[PDB]
Symmetry: C2
Subunit: 50 residues, 2 copies
């Protein structure tokens, strides 16, 4: 496995053309806040390719 | 996608029978002490099914 290449899997809105997103904030996919901790309905935005 | 189901992808050694590992420690896959922060050669142990 080469997990050094990552792609952003979760975002609130689509990107404008020629825009980059280097943020690492936890994507809240539920009603409960995440507080920067992964868990139930709180996911890391970047996933490795493998 | 249903990303609430996770599996442990990286571990130092294989598990014993009837043993569980709920620890969330950043697995170092290189020679760099990266202080528990994901990035190059430091991966999260848990990966989502999706």
């Amino acid at each position: 496995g080469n997990y050094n290449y990552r792609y952003r899997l979760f975002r609130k809105s689509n990107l404008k053309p020629f825009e980059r997103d280097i943020s690492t904030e936890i994507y809240q996919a539920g009603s409960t806040p995440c507080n920067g901790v992964q868990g139930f309905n709180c996911y890391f935005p970047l996933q490795s390719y493998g």
